[PDB]
Design a protein around this motif. Structure first.
Motif, PDB file in Angstrom:
ATOM      1  N   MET B 247    -115.771  -9.401  26.722  1.00 20.38           N
ATOM      2  CA  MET B 247    -115.351  -9.414  28.112  1.00 20.38           C
ATOM      3  C   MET B 247    -116.542  -9.575  29.044  1.00 20.38           C
ATOM      4  O   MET B 247    -117.686  -9.271  28.695  1.00 20.38           O
ATOM      5  N   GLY B 248    -116.245 -10.059  30.249  1.00 13.61           N
ATOM      6  CA  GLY B 248    -117.227 -10.196  31.295  1.00 13.61           C
ATOM      7  C   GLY B 248    -116.850  -9.337  32.481  1.00 13.61           C
ATOM      8  O   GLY B 248    -116.073  -8.384  32.357  1.00 13.61           O
ATOM      9  N   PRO B 249    -117.379  -9.662  33.664  1.00 17.23           N
ATOM     10  CA  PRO B 249    -117.115  -8.806  34.834  1.00 17.23           C
ATOM     11  C   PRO B 249    -115.648  -8.744  35.223  1.00 17.23           C
ATOM     12  O   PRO B 249    -115.255  -7.820  35.945  1.00 17.23           O
ATOM     13  N   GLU B 250    -114.826  -9.692  34.773  1.00 12.35           N
ATOM     14  CA  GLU B 250    -113.400  -9.668  35.073  1.00 12.35           C
ATOM     15  C   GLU B 250    -112.629  -8.650  34.241  1.00 12.35           C
ATOM     16  O   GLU B 250    -111.461  -8.385  34.545  1.00 12.35           O
ATOM     17  N   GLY B 251    -113.243  -8.079  33.209  1.00 17.78           N
ATOM     18  CA  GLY B 251    -112.543  -7.139  32.362  1.00 17.78           C
ATOM     19  C   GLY B 251    -111.398  -7.806  31.621  1.00 17.78           C
ATOM     20  O   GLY B 251    -111.455  -8.985  31.254  1.00 17.78           O
ATOM     21  N   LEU B 252    -110.330  -7.039  31.402  1.00 15.99           N
ATOM     22  CA  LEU B 252    -109.150  -7.538  30.709  1.00 15.99           C
ATOM     23  C   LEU B 252    -107.956  -7.725  31.637  1.00 15.99           C
ATOM     24  O   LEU B 252    -106.841  -7.958  31.155  1.00 15.99           O
ATOM     25  N   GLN B 253    -108.178  -7.687  32.967  1.00 17.22           N
ATOM     26  CA  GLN B 253    -107.173  -7.873  34.013  1.00 17.22           C
ATOM     27  C   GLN B 253    -107.320  -9.270  34.607  1.00 17.22           C
ATOM     28  O   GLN B 253    -108.441  -9.799  34.653  1.00 17.22           O
ATOM     29  N   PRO B 254    -106.232  -9.904  35.042  1.00 12.80           N
ATOM     30  CA  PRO B 254    -106.384 -11.209  35.694  1.00 12.80           C
ATOM     31  C   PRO B 254    -107.155 -11.066  37.004  1.00 12.80           C
ATOM     32  O   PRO B 254    -107.019 -10.067  37.715  1.00 12.80           O
ATOM     33  N   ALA B 255    -107.965 -12.075  37.320  1.00 22.63           N
ATOM     34  CA  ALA B 255    -108.787 -12.084  38.524  1.00 22.63           C
ATOM     35  C   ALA B 255    -108.438 -13.197  39.499  1.00 22.63           C
ATOM     36  O   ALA B 255    -108.594 -13.008  40.708  1.00 22.63           O
ATOM     37  N   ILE B 256    -107.972 -14.350  39.008  1.00 26.08           N
ATOM     38  CA  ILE B 256    -107.622 -15.448  39.910  1.00 26.08           C
ATOM     39  C   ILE B 256    -106.587 -15.007  40.932  1.00 26.08           C
ATOM     40  O   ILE B 256    -106.735 -15.347  42.116  1.00 26.08           O
ATOM     41  N   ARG B 258    -106.251 -12.460  42.591  1.00 24.57           N
ATOM     42  CA  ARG B 258    -106.873 -11.743  43.696  1.00 24.57           C
ATOM     43  C   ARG B 258    -107.300 -12.670  44.826  1.00 24.57           C
ATOM     44  O   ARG B 258    -107.417 -12.220  45.972  1.00 24.57           O
ATOM     45  N   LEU B 259    -107.540 -13.949  44.534  1.00 27.33           N
ATOM     46  CA  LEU B 259    -107.977 -14.883  45.564  1.00 27.33           C
ATOM     47  C   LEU B 259    -106.872 -15.208  46.559  1.00 27.33           C
ATOM     48  O   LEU B 259    -107.169 -15.684  47.660  1.00 27.33           O
ATOM     49  N   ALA B 260    -105.615 -14.961  46.203  1.00 25.71           N
ATOM     50  CA  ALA B 260    -104.493 -15.269  47.082  1.00 25.71           C
ATOM     51  C   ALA B 260    -104.146 -14.072  47.961  1.00 25.71           C
ATOM     52  O   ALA B 260    -105.023 -13.467  48.579  1.00 25.71           O
TER      53      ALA B 260
ATOM     54  N   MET C 166    -108.289 -10.450  22.890  1.00 28.08           N
ATOM     55  CA  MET C 166    -107.982  -9.884  24.199  1.00 28.08           C
ATOM     56  C   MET C 166    -106.477  -9.838  24.440  1.00 28.08           C
ATOM     57  O   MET C 166    -105.939  -8.807  24.859  1.00 28.08           O
TER      58      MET C 166
ATOM     59  N   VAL D 142    -117.022 -15.975  27.031  1.00 28.43           N
ATOM     60  CA  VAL D 142    -116.286 -14.734  27.249  1.00 28.43           C
ATOM     61  C   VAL D 142    -114.798 -15.041  27.186  1.00 28.43           C
ATOM     62  O   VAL D 142    -114.380 -16.192  27.319  1.00 28.43           O
ATOM     63  N   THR D 145    -108.042 -13.081  30.064  1.00 28.67           N
ATOM     64  CA  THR D 145    -106.640 -12.856  29.738  1.00 28.67           C
ATOM     65  C   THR D 145    -105.780 -14.033  30.183  1.00 28.67           C
ATOM     66  O   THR D 145    -105.854 -14.477  31.333  1.00 28.67           O
ATOM     67  N   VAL D 191    -105.423 -21.423  47.662  1.00 25.19           N
ATOM     68  CA  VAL D 191    -104.943 -20.053  47.518  1.00 25.19           C
ATOM     69  C   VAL D 191    -105.635 -19.144  48.526  1.00 25.19           C
ATOM     70  O   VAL D 191    -105.081 -18.111  48.928  1.00 25.19           O
ATOM     71  N   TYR D 206    -117.841 -10.266  40.557  1.00 24.19           N
ATOM     72  CA  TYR D 206    -118.139 -10.953  39.310  1.00 24.19           C
ATOM     73  C   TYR D 206    -119.404 -11.796  39.369  1.00 24.19           C
ATOM     74  O   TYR D 206    -119.706 -12.499  38.397  1.00 24.19           O
ATOM     75  N   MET D 247    -123.181  -9.867  32.874  1.00 29.30           N
ATOM     76  CA  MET D 247    -122.366  -8.680  33.061  1.00 29.30           C
ATOM     77  C   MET D 247    -121.262  -8.602  32.017  1.00 29.30           C
ATOM     78  O   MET D 247    -120.855  -9.606  31.427  1.00 29.30           O
ATOM     79  N   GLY D 248    -120.782  -7.378  31.805  1.00 28.49           N
ATOM     80  CA  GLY D 248    -119.673  -7.121  30.921  1.00 28.49           C
ATOM     81  C   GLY D 248    -118.517  -6.523  31.690  1.00 28.49           C
ATOM     82  O   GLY D 248    -118.432  -6.655  32.916  1.00 28.49           O
TER      83      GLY D 248
END
Lengths: 260, 260, 260, 260
Positions: B247-256, B258-260, C166, D142, D145, D191, D206, D247-248
């Motif tokens: 994993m990276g800084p986004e973790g295991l949660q969706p991040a895209i 969040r931009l909306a 993941m 990386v 999800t 978006v 991130y 980063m992780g």
């Protein structure tokens, strides 16, 4: 590669090596003033080669007092520092035979002193929002028989580059590392008999581009990362090894046919 | 995980930690005799639970004399060593605030002492053709705010593991490293209020498997690498981090979104 | 290596290779029933070697219908699947000379079919909370002259292993990859003239342990990762290459002296 | 970043994207003639802004006939090609839900078509001894999800970049890859409501530098690798991700305090 760094001040540890001089020349050509910090006395001749554009300060970077005096001298003659290139290293390395005392000496020179020199210059880099370039190697990504201290040191520099990048980003400072391969050297020039064409052919077995790298080719990557063109590059390792690190023990020659 | 190491002798530096205790139990269960080396006195209680199969030797591994004495005691009570697990470490780490003295102290304990302990035991491992397991971390592959000494030390251990593997292979000694994630520890138990499900709830954000690792789960990987089942494994880093390192800084949660 | 998988059902793609048979034997010894899916007809003789413990189902994994029929047959004769080992691959590879049609064929076999076989078995792995082992190689971490399709495929398998880990973790499924080096092969056995000692000496230049790996040594790592001893290992790449991947183009021989 | 590529001809697949447009402007500013290959019609407007120096050729790179026709048009209007930037990609990606057909379609566009376009232009790059830049991502290093096809495709591009570098080195062609992070894009602009500071606020979690990357910042790294300043750089991956990849799952915020 016509970057403009007019008026900026740069610091180059270990500037007496061929790579060091190429990095110094690259910075001067871009209009920057450079302070060469090194324990080697040949750095004075390099600084005089650029007259008032480059200054030499003989510095034992393992001595905190020597670092403070060097930064004081940089402030007196040149001014606030914008760029730091950590190129100082020792080749004290005998693998398993190296002693605990040798280990700590090599780590102090190769790694811990990079932190202290950065710390002594930090307020400058913070005010100038500068960039730092550390030096890894192909030896930080691979094992080489009989060499422990320098590869481990360089692998540690690689991680230090990442941790500096993270904890320096808030202050607008970028920190990256440069990973060269076999580069034409003072030591190689003497063991080869100042014979480049033969040394290139020996190096062809380990570099896709079939020769040793030129110090200037390494310096180009250093200047790019220092410049504002790399303004979104931080914490990265930029390889300038002519393809060394894409290969394994098979090299670039076929291996399956040997089985027949 | 029912390996037979009957009669073999193992040494576990830093055996007073939860990881160490799990590794000691795993080895004893496999029939091995174990020597616990640690600066912490809590190792004495761990050895006494196994009666004559496990020994405790309080050792400051930064002292060459202490290492020679520790090997002498192992020879007297247990015999020739077949397995070395280098788990000793210090968490002396203040990031950029750590001083030059702190750097060299942390490097001496985490890294250089691994070499000296390996050197003192080398003739045993050579005669027994044993295996060595060093400890890296998820911190050797990534940057963590405010933590420099331990991440850099572990990044150096990773390279040392590779160079040890190369220069030890001729003598039939295998050397590998284990990279755990957040594992249940004494320090976590104290900040957690000895609440495991609460500590698991925090770690789920950084581990695909949704909890902290168990010390035993790390010990399983250590035991495998020591055993002859890993007879073609040398110079490798075996991750037991529950998915942390993918994993990276986004973790295991969706991040895209969040931009909306 | 005495793991207990009594009553469990395993699926082994590409089980007709020497590695495949070793993985099948390792699973049977642990008490599991195994279904070998392969396009090669020699798998039938391997399945008959274990009598009712192993079943053979000739399957073209590029055909969705063939996969559905194979899972139907597994359910009829063996039951719910707990373990999937994706070992199927093609060695269709001519580097730059390979055509677009060859590329898509190799990617379909080596990569896309791994997804479809996992998808057809997913509800089983979800109910059983099983584990998956994919196969990378030393070729996924390095470049080899004249070989494009298989290295790129294996580098893609490595990333697929992480993304599966993941997105499968929520269902309690662990997904890892195994990265072997040169392993004794059917193809090597024929080009060498069934001469192992010579093939080992050729391989010594690329493996610290000085020989080809045994299929059994690879199978040990597969079983460990499938077993509950690896219960905190997911998304990891476990190297079983005898030290191949720690070396670069210099191999394990000195390189500096050649400069003189 | 004032490189001189006067008279040289470059080809940029996927040139209709913001990254493509920045790379096109960077090349034109450096004096090069540019051929924009893309399936998107928005490339036509980009080429017309530069008058006769830039050409647009609507191309479906999955069609071998389209590639041959595109190279024929480049020969007629501009001439022999020196630089190829492989930036064409598809975001067809539904993770595990993506079908076998979707997998092969995404691989054909993202990966296999890079080979065919390189093959059609090879004799030009060989005669001109040019350089190639492929595009990896932070997604190739990386797991994210719900995203399989694009991360796996880019992980495959990384290996292809290495194998291309090895087998092209004999002909004097350099091949490297660029790995950007979150860069300002058309999709993010829609978006985001064309709100950059708001999109920057999300990306700060991130990226160490606290924002999205600019397309120009990516183009700077592409231009460097194409230029002769990178003359000892081949087979390398140059990250321009603002610190994303160091980063992780913990990001750039402390995580240990959360346990208390």
């Amino acid at each position: 590669m016509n970057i403009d760094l007019k008026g900026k001040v740069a610091v180059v540890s270990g500037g007496a090596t061929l790579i060091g001089k190429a990095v110094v020349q690259a910075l001067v050509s871009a209009g920057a003033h450079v302070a060469i910090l090194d324990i080697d006395a040949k750095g004075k001749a390099i600084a005089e080669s650029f007259n008032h554009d480059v200054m030499f300060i003989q510095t034992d970077l393992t001595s905190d007092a020597a670092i403070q005096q060097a930064v004081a001298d940089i402030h007196q003659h040149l001014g606030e520092v914008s760029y730091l290139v950590n190129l100082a290293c020792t080749y004290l390395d005998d693998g398993f035979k190296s002693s605990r005392q040798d280990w700590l000496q090599a780590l102090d020179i190769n790694l811990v002193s990079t932190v202290e020199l950065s710390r002594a210059l930090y307020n400058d880099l913070k005010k100038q929002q500068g960039s730092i370039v550390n030096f890894t190697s192909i030896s930080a990504k691979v094992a080489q028989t009989g060499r422990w201290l320098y590869p481990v040191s360089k692998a540690a520099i690689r991680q230090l580059t990442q941790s500096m990048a993270m904890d320096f980003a808030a202050d607008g400072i970028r920190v990256n590392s440069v990973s060269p391969g076999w580069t034409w050297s003072r030591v190689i020039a003497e063991v080869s008999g100042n014979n480049r064409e033969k040394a290139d052919s020996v190096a062809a077995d380990y570099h896709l581009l079939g020769r040793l790298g030129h110090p200037e080719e390494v310096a180009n990557v250093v200047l790019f990362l220092l410049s504002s063109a790399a303004s979104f590059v931080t914490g990265a390792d930029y390889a300038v090894d002519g393809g060394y690190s894409v290969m394994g023990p098979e090299g670039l020659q076929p291996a399956i046919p040997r089985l027949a």
